[PDB]
Amino acid sequence: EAVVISGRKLAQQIKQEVRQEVEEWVASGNKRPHLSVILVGENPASHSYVLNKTRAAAVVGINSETIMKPASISEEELLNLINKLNNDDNVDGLLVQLPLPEHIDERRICNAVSPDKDVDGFHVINVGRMCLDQYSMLPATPWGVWEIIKRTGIPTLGKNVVVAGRSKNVGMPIAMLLHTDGAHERPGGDATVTISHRYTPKEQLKKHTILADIVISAAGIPNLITADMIKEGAAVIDVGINRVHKLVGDVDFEGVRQKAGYITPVPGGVGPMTVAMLMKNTIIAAKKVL
Amino acid sequence: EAVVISGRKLAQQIKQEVRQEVEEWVASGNKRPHLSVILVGENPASHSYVLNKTRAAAVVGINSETIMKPASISEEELLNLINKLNNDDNVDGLLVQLPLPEHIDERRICNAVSPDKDVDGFHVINVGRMCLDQYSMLPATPWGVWEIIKRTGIPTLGKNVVVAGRSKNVGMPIAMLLHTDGAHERPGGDATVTISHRYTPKEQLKKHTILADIVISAAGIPNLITADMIKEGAAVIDVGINRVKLVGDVDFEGVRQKAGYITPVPGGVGPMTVAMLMKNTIIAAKKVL
Numbered sequence: 313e314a315v316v317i318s319g320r321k322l323a324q325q326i327k328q329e330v331r332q333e334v335e336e337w338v339a340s341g342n343k344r345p346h347l348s349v350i351l352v353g354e355n356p357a358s359h360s361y362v363l364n365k366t367r368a369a370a371v372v373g374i375n376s377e378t379i380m381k382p383a384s385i386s387e388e389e390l391l392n393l394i395n396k397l398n399n400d401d402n403v404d405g406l407l408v409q410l411p412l413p414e415h416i417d418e419r420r421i422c423n424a425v426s427p428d429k430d431v432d433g434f435h436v437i438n439v440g441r442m443c444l445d446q447y448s449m450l451p452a453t454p455w456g457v458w459e460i461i462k463r464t465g466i467p468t469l470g471k472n473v474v475v476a477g478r479s480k481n482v483g484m485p486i487a488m489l490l491h492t493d494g495a496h497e498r499p500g501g502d503a504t505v506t507i508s509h510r511y512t513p514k515e516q517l518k519k520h521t522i523l524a525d526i527v528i529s530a531a532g533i534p535n536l537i538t539a540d541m542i543k544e545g546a547a548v549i550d551v552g553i554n555r556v557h558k559l560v561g562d563v564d565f566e567g568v569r570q571k572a573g574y575i576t577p578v579p580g581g582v583g584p585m586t587v588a589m590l591m592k593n594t595i596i597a598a599k600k601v602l
Numbered sequence: 603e604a605v606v607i608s609g610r611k612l613a614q615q616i617k618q619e620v621r622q623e624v625e626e627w628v629a630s631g632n633k634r635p636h637l638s639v640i641l642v643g644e645n646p647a648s649h650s651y652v653l654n655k656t657r658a659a660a661v662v663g664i665n666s667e668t669i670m671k672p673a674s675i676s677e678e679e680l681l682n683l684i685n686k687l688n689n690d691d692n693v694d695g696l697l698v699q700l701p702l703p704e705h706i707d708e709r710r711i712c713n714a715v716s717p718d719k720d721v722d723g724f725h726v727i728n729v730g731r732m733c734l735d736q737y738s739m740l741p742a743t744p745w746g747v748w749e750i751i752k753r754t755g756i757p758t759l760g761k762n763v764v765v766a767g768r769s770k771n772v773g774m775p776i777a778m779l780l781h782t783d784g785a786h787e788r789p790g791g792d793a794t795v796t797i798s799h800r801y802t803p804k805e806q807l808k809k810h811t812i813l814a815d816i817v818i819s820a821a822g823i824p825n826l827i828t829a830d831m832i833k834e835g836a837a838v839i840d841v842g843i844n845r846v847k848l849v850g851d852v853d854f855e856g857v858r859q860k861a862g863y864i865t866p867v868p869g870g871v872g873p874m875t876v877a878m879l880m881k882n883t884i885i886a887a888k889k890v891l
């Protein structure tokens with residue numbers, strides 16, 4: 313039966329590392345780090361996730377503020393707020409929680425955040441640098457997936473990995489981190505990575521997952537991953553968060569638990585790792601090492 | 603038996619299309635486009651490929667110059683020449699042929715080319731925009747691979763594709779173009795794409811290619827792809843150029859018997875790289891993006 317990886321326990325370790333790093337930093341006379349989160353509208357999941365972020369910030373010694381704006385805000389008004397925060401020397405990290413309302417272009421917003429404060433790694437320069445395996449601010453959810461695998465001791469070099477999903481903020485950076493060269497500026501996992509997505513026929517997904525040492529599902533589809541698709545002993549990382557009737561990932565947890573060697577639960581899996589890796593990025597931004 | 607796709611013939615058609623676009627741009631009262639190529643050192647392959655680029659420039663009515671420098675040039679000296687050409691309004695396109703000597707950082711060089719003149723698509727802004735499926739200057743070799751597939755009518759949506767190679771200038775852009783959404787700003791191929799590389803075991807590569815409708819080899823290893831690794835009727839695109847006589851990564855004669863489509867080396871992807879650069883140069887001259 314599968315080892316159930318605890319994302320809560322792993323994130324606790326990561327957050328303790330960050331609290332130590334932040335306290336040594338402050339002890340040496342530097343300004344305490346400060347994270348600013350802009351939250352637009354009333355997406356209940358967004359508010360929940362943002363509160364988790366600012367709670368984690370407080371615990372690791374990072375100051376924060378959440379700036380909430382109505383969904384009726386215009387794009388120019390959001391751009392003005394971002395520019396004021398970019399020029400606030402007290403602000404080390406700045407992020408705009410997504411999704412935004414339809415009348416606001418998310419790509420224009422993400423590029424308006426100063427790249428040195430872009431703890432999301434969503435600015436086009438940060439995306440480009442990541443895709444070139446250069447030192448960059450890694451996006452939190454893909455980095456959390458990476459850390460789950462590395463800290464559990466699951467090997468990647470030469471292994472088969474299937475990613476279900478190709479979104480620019482989650483699925484694509486995961487595939488980028490896992491297949492790239494361990495010896496580059498920002499190391500990668502050196503895996504053989506298959507990218508699947510909404511036009512990958514179900515049968516073709518199974519023909520690739522059955523070969524996979526690691527299946528990473530980031531599609532937002534309940535029960536997309538079932539035991540017949542998984543190689544015995546494989547690691548299965550569940551990124552989706554789906555409301556069914558209750559929260560479940562993309563994986564049939566109880567079924568796949570019987571065949572996989574490792575599996576992450578939903579909740580308590582990838583989610584807490586997302587929050588923890590943002591803490592890593594915020595101290596990185598405060599140190600201005602990039 | 604496999605259809606052999608003439609990259610040479612496709613490229614020559616594309617160059618005629620560029621020639622017409624350039625001639626009408628000039629006839630409309632605009633300055634004739636000019637491409638500058640910086641060549642550092644004495645890599646014979648680099649010298650040959652740049653010559654093919656400047657030959658194709660003359661064919662399509664684009665002015666050009668190659669500026670050759672010794673390998674002992676410093677990075678600051680190369681940066682100075684690039685800044686000079688960035689500020690020369692007669693220069694529409696500027697590229698620095700790779701590879702560069704070890705003491706010169708290619709990424710710093712590529713990022714010093716003004717983005718408007720970056721006909722390689724190597725500037726980090728172009729890379730980032732491409733990785734986000736936004737309008738961008740696409741790198742010539744990946745765009746040539748895409749054009750071979752599209753102009754031949756080989757379908758990609760829902761298909762299995764294997765790329766052997768993950769280099770930032772060739773293999774990674776090819777995988778990015780082929781797997782991404784056809785509905786985005788810069789459409790992708792909507793294929794299921796497997797990225798393999800130097801740490802993929804030969805056995806595992808074969809277990810993926812055998813499912814593949816398109817196999818694209820950009821590794822630089824003779825006979826990496828053999829008929830047993832290919833499924834009946836697949837399309838095999840050979841990006842490698844290996845001196846062994848020039849061969850590709852593919853066992854041309856063997857795979858020829860099982861593939862439905864195949865590109866030869868030489869005369870395959872290579873000529874398409876040169877033709878897509880000409881496309882990029884007239885795009886850069888028009889200040890399209």
Ligand SMILES: NC(=O)c1ccc[n+]([C@@H]2O[C@H](COP(=O)([O-])OP(=O)(O)OC[C@H]3O[C@@H](n4cnc5c(N)ncnc54)[C@H](O)[C@@H]3O)[C@@H](O)[C@H]2O)c1
Nearest residue numbers: 453476477478479482509510531532551552553582583586
């Ligand atoms: N911390 C976390 O645990 C965390 C963080 C971010 C996102 N998520 C979750 O990840 C999921 C996806 O988020 P997103 O923003 O990337 O969503 P999105 O809708 O932008 O992308 C979903 C992806 O799934 C792919 N897909 C659709 N149908 C598929 C199929 N049958 N097979 C394979 N792929 C298919 C799509 O092509 C798309 O790339 C959601 O559940 C979201 O909440 C979780």
Ligand SMILES: NC(=O)c1ccc[n+]([C@@H]2O[C@H](COP(=O)([O-])OP(=O)(O)OC[C@H]3O[C@@H](n4cnc5c(N)ncnc54)[C@H](O)[C@@H]3O)[C@@H](O)[C@H]2O)c1
Nearest residue numbers: 743767768769772799800820821822841842843871872875
């Ligand atoms: N227009 C053209 O025809 C064109 C253009 C550019 C490059 N090329 C050719 O493509 C080849 C590679 O070019 P590059 O710039 O990507 O070179 P590179 O040396 O930077 O990259 C080689 C790539 O091959 C991968 N690889 C190595 N061994 C492998 C194996 N056994 N299985 C799978 N992948 C493996 C490596 O991991 C790496 O990603 C060369 O032959 C080069 O001349 C051709």
Ligand SMILES: Nc1nc(N)c(NC(=O)Nc2ccc(C(=O)N[C@@H](CCc3nnn[nH]3)C(=O)O)cc2Cl)c(=O)[nH]1
Nearest residue numbers: 361364407408409410411432452579580581583584586
């Ligand atoms: N700019 C920007 N915008 C974005 N949207 C993101 N993404 C993002 O924040 N993702 C995210 C973050 C944290 C959680 C989390 O805390 N998960 C817990 C609790 C689940 C739960 N929910 N309700 N009850 N329990 C769990 O999964 O266990 C879940 C998610 Cl998806 C970003 O990173 N940057």
Ligand SMILES: Nc1nc(N)c(NC(=O)Nc2ccc(C(=O)N[C@@H](CCc3nnn[nH]3)C(=O)O)cc2Cl)c(=O)[nH]1
Nearest residue numbers: 650651654697698699700722742868869870872873875
């Ligand atoms: N900045 C920058 N740097 C780079 N390195 C590249 N890549 C690049 O130029 N690739 C490239 C271009 C043309 C050819 C070609 O003409 N192939 C012919 C002739 C074969 C032959 N050659 N010698 N003898 N025979 C054939 O394949 O038939 C082959 C290649 Cl690899 C770039 O695009 N931009």
